[PDB]
Amino acid sequence: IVEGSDAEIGMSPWQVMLFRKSPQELLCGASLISDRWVLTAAHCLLYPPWDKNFTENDLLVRIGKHSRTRYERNIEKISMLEKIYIHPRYNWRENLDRDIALMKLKKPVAFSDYIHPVCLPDRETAASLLQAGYKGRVTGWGNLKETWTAGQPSVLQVVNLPIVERPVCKDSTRIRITDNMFCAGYKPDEGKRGDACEGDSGGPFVMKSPFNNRWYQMGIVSWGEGCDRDGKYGFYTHVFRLKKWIQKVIDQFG
C-alpha cells in the first residue's frame, strides 16, 4: 500500500495473508468470508504467463495478522487449504476479467478479537455504495512504493480511496475494462494520493454500510499499472457481480 498508514489492531480482522510454503514468502492478500472460506484474486493462484499455477499443498493462509514478517504467536492462525476454486471464466489471457477465487480451509478457523469475517454485499448495498466519489478501504502488506532499494511495511497498511467514474477509469488505460471491474484512487488534481501495490493483490476493498454499520467487501485488489502513478487508478474485482458464482461454489462444496 502506497501512502497509507499502519492499521490499528483488529481494524481488518478479515485480512488474510496468502503465504508460499517454500520459499516462505508473501504472495498476496485475501479475506475471510466465513470460518472455512477465504476469498482472493484468481491471479494470485493462476497466472500462466508467469508460470504460476499453485496447488493447495503449495500454500498456507495466515489469519489474524498485523505484523508482516513476524510469527504472531497466540494471535495469528495458520490454515492449510482443502481446495482452490478459480472462476471458470477468469480471463488470464487478456485483462484479468473475473479475477476471483475461493479457498476452502481444511479446518474451520476460530474467531477471535483478531479474526472475524467480512460481509459480502447484497444487490442493494452494492447499488447504493458503488458510486463515484464514495470511498472504500484497501489493506495489505504489499510494497510501500512502486520503486525502492532493498520499501516494505512492518505492519498491515490501510488506505481509503474513492471509487472513480467509469469513463475516467477507462480513459486512464489501454486495457479493456469490463463490468466485472471498478477502479479507485484520487485524481491528479485532488491533493491526496494512495494505491495498492505489489503484494496487495487479492486483498479486500471494503466499505462500511451507513445503513447497518457493517463492513462489506465490494472489491478484490486486482491490478494496476505501477503504483500510485498520477492519472492511473487501481482496478478491483466487482465482488457483487460475481457473487452468484461465490454462492454456487459455497452451496455445492461447503
Binding site: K21, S22, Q24, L60, Y71, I78, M80
Partner: peptide, 12 residues
Amino acid sequence: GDFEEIPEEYLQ
C-alpha cells in the same frame, strides 16, 4: 530470511 520461521507443524 525476511519472514520469521513458522512452526513446523504447519509445514507437514
